[PDB]
DNA sequence: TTTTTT
């Protein structure tokens, strides 16, 4: 019958268009699933895939109204919804998905059955994903400077590696990590390194998600954690002064389930999938309002005890108590981190740690033996 | 006359399009009633049903403009409205509806008179609906290790079975159930098992539906309860501190009526049908602003008294009063629960329980003798 | 000359389309005046009336574009508006209009001169409108159980009958009736019986109209009171505690006028005709911010003093003060009420009460000898 | 084959239209990367570029329908997102981008590869960018008057020059500078000079961003800092009064990060780029809530020691202990400053200073030894 | 303030 109907049937046969649960129409272009709500991408996919059709059918696919007719025919054939993000050991990129169980990097048709929606936003460069490189040497030097691998800092180093590496798998975690340390110790440098490593799967929200009710009214901070694999809560304010609200234990206990409750502005969606590895950048000891067994089993803390300073404050840092080693500060480090110099090296280090630690199963274990408030309860 | 008008008349003769009370246009495709408020589905139904018409009539159902013309013709014939979800003991799936009185599964045109708008979303596979299976044995062991069938725990076990089986019927209930218990006991595991069992007929709202006014302004947390067969209000906070809002008895009174008043954003419809078995996952025993007879007969409480722990703190938990039986924590249990492995077995168990308990008639009976606050008013 | 203009003139000459003061376009199809905002029914009317036209004109009336053109022609002829709903003693049904002065039921064009906009939503069947029937006996027994016809309960019985029967007349009532009583007495049963009786002339709204202003912003809770003949506001909160807002006498005084000010979303029509009988289901004596004689002549109270109980707690209820009679609860009553078993019987009883009471003139009256707050001002 | 498709290809491959990460389209007309979300400038670009095509292609760019078709065809070719504002050493004007490495100024296609979004708002005129001019001499006299270049005031002079010159590059600053001085000293003079120099890349808001939280509710002051290169904080109230708000340290720590978290009204985007130099205009010694080493490395203070007054209080100014030199006040300065008589002269001075100081890298240093509150902790 | 708008 109609020629454009055959075009729609052929586009549907290759299985490039899917109907999601939320009602969006995800397409498959440039080896990455993409979607949008205000402007659907069906016509973009049609024009892109034009080339893979027979000769007499390609020339028919240039007039915009014919493309619109093909899209209208396509939209009348998608009746069944398909769920997304069911594989929790994959790291999708802009040109494929990097498998984590064995380090292979699929692309094209091979990297298609893993229906991943979110993506890092940048392509994968296999040349720089090699272990031996000067960038790897510099990165290893920096990592060892931040967390020295001595015997007194063994369990701390293992916890640091495990927590940092947990930011790759897209599963649900069950513990919160506190980056405790003094001033100018390396927390923000680690944050920026991780952000450059994973890219789009990393958001930074405010402290409001910890001490305020997250049910009444809109709360876009909760709504922006949808399908993210890492969330940072930086600069926790001190509580030694008055007027500062305590950390609600209910909020912590509500941030470790596969579905958190919260809605964005002007919308009615109230369910958010929770794949986030929540890390809190603090400067002082945290204080809570209620303490019980249900809270002490969901808290972990790693300590940074290496101070980077200038020659001016060398004697001040040497005689301090919160530091165990003093090192020379560097100026170009903060400069060339944003330029994505240690990106692929850190990615390789993270995947190596992931395959070393979480290969059978991924899980985080609380360490409540470090907080004095919980040390009192260790009765 | 116009051949398109004949097409519309033939489509209407098959009784596939219906005009519901709220003003939607439900269709009948893939053995399930579907509807969407944003985009109509009449064109999809026309395209899908083009096959059941003579050969000369099929060729006109290909051009989208003709399909829109037929949709416009159909929309000007539905004058009289009908109501949906009149039978409360039928479970609608994505490819049929399963009867609950005798376990018979209907499909096709036979499963059409029961106008069930809602659906679980996943198809029915009778090959996995049998009693003999290793999955059934594992699920039975898990259930018996969560709520043991000893003599001391007989009434609690039967109340647990009754409450869980009540999540299948499609009529109004009259009791709120609290899943009271200590930490690491088996509450969230039961919640996730039920979610895997009943699929999409299971929503999770915040605690604002309990300690806040649900009338003024928008409130999608109430508007999403429309025709839901189960509702969870998880993770209740403690009320022994300051500024802790008590549970308003007015909300509890309202949540047990056939109509719950509340509207979503950008809409005018304010009435919502209530089919939900409200279950609250709490950790401390609740306290209300006032206690009276009208609140005495609308609350039931079950107890979970089996702690799961790792060999680390085994003796620390064995020396506690809050537990009656200590077992070993299993890691992969949640991993294979999220994969929907114990879905159909638990569905079969739920059907068996419902047929054992509520087959003559369905009702829930309160247990007010569990709350010390309620105990004082009868002391 | 033109042809579609002749068809439009013929349609208008039959006097089937009218323009209201609010600016709507009411349509006379299937023996009922219908109207809707989202979907204009003029095309539906054209398609329905196609049958009573000359044959050479009927075939022209099948293309949707031609129907749209005829609708556009019709919309440009209605220059003068016509008032609606001026007869206050008519009950409009889905298949005609039932009189309330002599019990006769008109149909067809005879029941067209009464411009009735709203409708009950269900058809009228004279087969079940008889006096002798087992359902009538059951309903009479239930009514006598809820309100015994004793000498001490004589005035309350007649006030209850008058208040229930006042929900049929489409005029303005200047009194608010309170359903004051203790738990498990039968207020909800009466509400459900009334709802099954009248049908769509019954709206339930939240308590936000009694404790919050009804002017600021959109307020569909008040905007849905337009031409509704009954309004119920159950689950009245207690006020003995702190933080409970008292009932504003301003709202009560404003709700007793033939025009309440309130607007729905997406509209500018802020005038609402009040034909409702406001009834409140309460369990405590209501309180207000201030008490005055102007609030005295608008409030009436009936008392429910028949506790229904299961055999488990028969003795405890028998030893109570706030009850005068204890009976056995029936589980199937609420189940079979939802099936509209006692619909036409209660309709006939209400018609009989209306013919007995309000035939000369209809007016509600206050009983200020019930509320202790008002008894203070009578001291 | 097709003819408009080749036109769209020619428009695309010349790299004139680009897609941003937020979903908007930026075009290139009038030598500026302007964009509008409501008015698409694609048609304007097509009609402007029609001159650079063969004579047989121009005739098809006259019908508005054909230009709309070309726009629609172009919109279906932008698949990959492009990030903007990556070069931190380019100052964008309205008619081109001025480089800072060598002082050369580009325009047209040259100043196009640098995807600059924001702009100063005024055109660049090379004829007024000379080194010798009466405006240069008057401006140099003013600058030497406000900050005398004595050996007692050498470090302060160069620190002032560095802080002023830092307001050109688009990197991320890491220090806050206090323009602490007495009244009528010349702080507003420098503010107005800078505002005339850089124009649109300069905003001034209230002091609330220093004594308030930055997470609760909306914060339009944060959304105003997006891609701004200089922020001036004036009208700082005295703190030695009663109940005066204290400068919150947490705001200072959160205001020096590459991304500040905060959402504007009615919006959901919570991330913001921090390219702005923060200069605070106080009058007295600032007091904070808490002093710690984390606040020691984010504070810089310059001193103004030249008072201006009329001969009225000449002896009072000459005898005051807080000044170092007093001169005669001028009235026409604020007249010709608002007429931008010292616009390009100050710009050239700023460019010279930037080339002198921050040509290898950009970095601002703190100076903790200028406030006694910070001299207390020398122990 | 948001929602409502628009
Ligand atoms: N391995 C390293 N080698 C050289 N310099 C380093 C190294 N790690 C960090 N630095 C530098 O030392 C400083 C450490 O800053 P850091 O990231 O600890 O700050 P922060 O966590 O934001 O501080 P605070 O807790 O005071 O707010 C930075 O100037 C950084 O460039
Ligand atoms: N029968 C079983 N055998 C072994 N492990 C089990 C069994 N049932 C549950 N578990 C595991 O024991 C743990 C119990 O955790 P659960 O989700 O029940 O906690 P919870 O009731 O939500 O806790 P809290 O009150 O602290 O929030 C889970 O890891 C679950 O997988
Ligand atoms: N005549 C009757 N005989 C037997 N049972 C009856 C009779 N009338 C009502 N009932 C039953 O008694 C119960 C009355 O409960 P109902 O919901 O009417 O109480 P209520 O007064 O609204 O309660 P509350 O104010 O506490 O919410 C229902 O189960 C109803 O079916
Ligand atoms: N170098 C100068 N030469 C002439 N007049 C000056 C000079 N510096 C400041 N003034 C005059 O002093 C007046 C007030 O100075 P102002 O910039 O307001 O000081 P502050 O910023 O401390 O309030 C201005 O109107 C300006 O004309
Ligand atoms: Mg840092
Ligand atoms: Mg739990
Ligand atoms: Mg009630």
D203-205 and C326-328 strand pairing:
unpaired
For the four alpha carbons of B100, B103, B104 and B106, in that order, the dihedral sign comes to: positive
Count of residues in chain C:
379
The pair of three-digit structure tokens given for residue D266, joined into one six-digit string: 């009615």
Point out the residue among C183, C240, C338 whose CB comes nearest to the CB of B293: C183
The whole-angstrom separation of Cα B197 and Cα B209 is 25
The whole-angstrom separation of Cα D32 and Cα D27 is 8
- The number of helices, as runs of H, and strands, as runs of E, in chain C is 15, 15
The whole-angstrom separation of Cα D206 and Cα D224 is 12
Q: Are B317 and B274 in contact (CB under 8 A)?
A: no
* Distance from the Cα of residue D294 to its chain's centroid: 26
Which position has the token pair 């530091």?
A323
| 8 Å CB contact of D297 and A235 | no
Q: Are B234 and B204 in contact (CB under 8 A)?
A: yes
Count of residues in chain D:
379
- Residue C41 has what DSSP assignment? S
- Residue C51 has what DSSP assignment? G
Contacts of A215 in chain B (CB under 8 A): 206-208, 221
For residue A126, what are the contacts with CB-CB under 8 A and spacing of at least 6? A105
The whole-angstrom separation of Cα C362 and Cα C166 is 8
3-state helix vs strand vs coil in chain C, percent to 5: 35, 15, 50
The whole-angstrom separation of Cα A198 and Cα A121 is 9
For residue A334, what are the contacts with CB-CB under 8 A and spacing of at least 6? A189, A192
The whole-angstrom separation of Cα B284 and Cα B301 is 12
Q: How far is the first Cα of chain D from the last one, in angstroms, to the nearest whole number?
A: 82
Exposed / middle / buried, residue C130 (Cβ in 10 Å: 0-12, 13-18, 19+) = exposed
DSSP of C106-150, one letter per residue? Answer: E-GGGGGSS------SS---GGG--S--HHHHHHHHHHHHHS---
The whole-angstrom separation of Cα D211 and Cα D236 is 10
Q: Are A205 and A305 in contact (CB under 8 A)?
A: no
For residue B124, what are the contacts with CB-CB under 8 A and spacing of at least 6? B93, B94, B95, B96, B98, B105
Which position has the token pair 């034009």?
A50
Where on strand E do bases come within 7 A of a protein Cβ? 1-5
- Residue B300 has what DSSP assignment? E
DSSP of A120-184, one letter per residue? Answer: -SS---SSS--S-SHHHHHHHHHHHHHS---STTHHHHHHHHHHHHTTSS-S----EEEEEE-SS
The whole-angstrom separation of Cα D261 and Cα D272 is 7
Q: How far is the first Cα of chain B from the last one, in angstroms, to the nearest whole number?
A: 81
Produce one character per residue of D176-207: b if its CB has 16 or more CB atoms within 10 Å, e if not: bbbbbbeeebbbebbbebbbbbbbebbeebeb
For residue B301, what are the contacts with CB-CB under 8 A and spacing of at least 6? B177, B178, B180, B367, B370, B371
Q: For residue B11, give the H/E element and its range.
A: helix B3-13
B277-281 and B230-234 strand pairing:
parallel
- B109-116 long-range Cβ contacts below 8 angstroms, 24+ apart: B111/B31, B112/B28, B114/B87, B114/B90, B115/B18, B115/B26, B115/B33, B115/B82, B115/B83, B115/B84, B115/B85, B115/B86, B116/B33, B116/B84, B116/B85, B116/B87, B116/B90, B116/B92
In 3-state terms, what secondary structure has residue C300?
strand
Largest Cα–Cα separation, chain C: 87
The whole-angstrom separation of Cα B42 and Cα B34 is 10
The pair of three-digit structure tokens given for residue C110, joined into one six-digit string: 């005879």
DSSP of B72-134, one letter per residue? Answer: HHHHTT--S-------SSEEEETTEEEESSS--EE-GGGGGSS------SS---GGG--S-SH
The whole-angstrom separation of Cα B99 and Cα C69 is 50
The whole-angstrom separation of Cα C323 and Cα C306 is 6
* Distance from the Cα of residue B187 to its chain's centroid: 17
| Residue D179: strand pairing partners | D302
In 3-state terms, what secondary structure has residue D369?
helix
The whole-angstrom separation of Cα D277 and Cα B141 is 65
The whole-angstrom separation of Cα B260 and Cα A126 is 58
Rg from Cα positions in chain A: 24
DSSP of C183-250, one letter per residue? Answer: SSSSHHHHHHHHHHHH-SS-EE--THHHHS-S-SS--HHHHTTBT-S-EEE--PPP-SSTTPPPBPHH
By a Cβ cutoff of 8 Å, what residues of chain D touch chain A?
1-2, 5, 23, 69, 72-73, 76-77, 79-81, 214-216, 250, 253-254, 257-259, 261-263, 266-268, 270-271, 289-290, 292-294, 296-297, 361, 363
Method: cryo-EM
The whole-angstrom separation of Cα B137 and Cα B150 is 19
The whole-angstrom separation of Cα A25 and Cα C148 is 63
The whole-angstrom separation of Cα B338 and Cα A87 is 11
- Residue B200 has what DSSP assignment? T
Point out the residue among D2, D215, D259 whose CB comes nearest to the CB of A204: D259
Q: Is D274 left (phi over 0), alpha (psi -120 to 50) or beta?
A: beta
3-state helix vs strand vs coil in chain A, percent to 5: 35, 15, 50
Q: Which nucleotide is nearest to B217 (CA to C1')?
A: E3
* Distance from the Cα of residue B115 to its chain's centroid: 17
The whole-angstrom separation of Cα D347 and Cα A90 is 52
Subunits next to D (3 or more Cβ pairs <8 Å) are A
Other Cβ atoms less than 10 A from the Cβ of C133: the count is 14
- C18-22 long-range Cβ contacts below 8 angstroms, 24+ apart: C18/C78, C18/C82, C18/C84, C18/C115, C19/C78, C19/C80, C19/C81, C19/C82, C20/C81, C20/C82, C20/C83, C20/C84, C20/C117, C21/C81, C21/C83, C21/C84, C22/C269, C22/C271
Interface test with A, best of D175, D294, D379 (most A CBs within 10 A): D294
Q: Tell how far the Cα of D333 is from the centroid of ligand 4, in angstroms.
A: 8
The whole-angstrom separation of Cα B39 and Cα A75 is 11
Q: Are A99 and A105 in contact (CB under 8 A)?
A: yes
For residue D89, what are the contacts with CB-CB under 8 A and spacing of at least 6? D99, D100, D101, D169, D170
Q: For residue A234, give the H/E element and its range.
A: strand A231-234
Position in ligand 3 atom list of the atom nearest CA C235: 27
A278-281 and A231-234 strand pairing:
parallel
Q: Are A142 and A308 in contact (CB under 8 A)?
A: no
Q: Tell how far the Cα of A346 is from the centroid of ligand 1, in angstroms.
A: 18
Exposed / middle / buried, residue B134 (Cβ in 10 Å: 0-12, 13-18, 19+) = exposed
DSSP of A280-330, one letter per residue? Answer: EE-SS---BS---HHHHTSEEEEEE--EEE-GGGHHHHHT-SS-S-EEE--
Q: Are D318 and D325 in contact (CB under 8 A)?
A: no
Strands (E) in D118-188, as ranges, are 176-180
Q: Are D364 and D178 in contact (CB under 8 A)?
A: no
Q: Are B302 and B180 in contact (CB under 8 A)?
A: yes
Exposed / middle / buried, residue C341 (Cβ in 10 Å: 0-12, 13-18, 19+) = middle
The whole-angstrom separation of Cα A146 and Cα A134 is 19
The whole-angstrom separation of Cα A151 and Cα B139 is 45
For A6, the closest chain B residue by CA position comes to B62
């Amino acid at each position: 019958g109609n020629k454009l109907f055959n075009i729609a049937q052929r586009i549907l046969d290759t299985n490039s268009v899917l109907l999601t649960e939320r009602g969006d129409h995800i397409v498959w272009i440039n080896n990455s699933w993409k979607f949008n709500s205000e402007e659907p991408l069906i016509t973009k996919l049609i024009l892109s895939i034009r080339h893979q059709l027979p000769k007499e059918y390609s020339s028919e696919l240039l007039c915009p109204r014919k493309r619109k007719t093909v899209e209208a025919n396509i939209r009348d054939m998608l009746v069944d919804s398909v769920e997304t993000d069911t594989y929790p050991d994959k790291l999708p990129f802009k040109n494929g998905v990097l498998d984590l169980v064995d380090g292979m990097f699929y692309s094209g048709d091979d990297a298609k059955k893993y229906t991943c929606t979110v993506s890092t936003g940048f392509k994968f460069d296999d040349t720089k994903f090699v272990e031996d490189s000067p960038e790897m040497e510099e990165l290893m030097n920096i990592i060892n400077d931040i967390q020295p691998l001595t015997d007194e800092n063994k369990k701390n180093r293992e916890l640091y590696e495990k927590t940092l590496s947990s930011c790759l798998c897209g599963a649900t975690k069950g513990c919160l990590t506190f980056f405790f340390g003094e001033t100018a110790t390396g927390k923000s440098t680690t944050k920026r390194l991780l952000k450059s490593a994973i890219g789009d799967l990393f958001v930074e929200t405010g402290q409001t998600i910890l001490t305020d009710v997250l049910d009444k009214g809109p709360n876009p901070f909760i709504a922006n954690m949808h399908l993210k694999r890492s969330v940072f809560c930086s600069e926790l304010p001190d509580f030694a002064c008055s007027g500062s609200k305590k950390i609600r234990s209910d909020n912590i206990k509500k941030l470790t389930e596969p579905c958190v409750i919260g809605r964005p502005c002007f919308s009615n969606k109230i369910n958010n999938r929770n794949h986030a590895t929540i890390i809190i950048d603090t400067n002082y000891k945290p204080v809570f309002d209620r303490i019980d067994n249900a809270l002490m089993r969901r808290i972990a803390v790693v300590r940074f005890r290496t101070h980077f300073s200038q020659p001016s404050g060398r004697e001040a840092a040497e005689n301090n108590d919160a530091y165990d080693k003093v090192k020379l500060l560097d100026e170009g480090l903060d400069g060339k981190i944003q330029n994505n110099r240690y990106r692929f090296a850190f990615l390789y280090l993270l995947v190596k740690w992931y395959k070393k630690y979480h290969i059978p199963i991924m899980k985080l274990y609380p360490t409540p033996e470090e907080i004095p408030d919980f040390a009192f309860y260790l009765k």
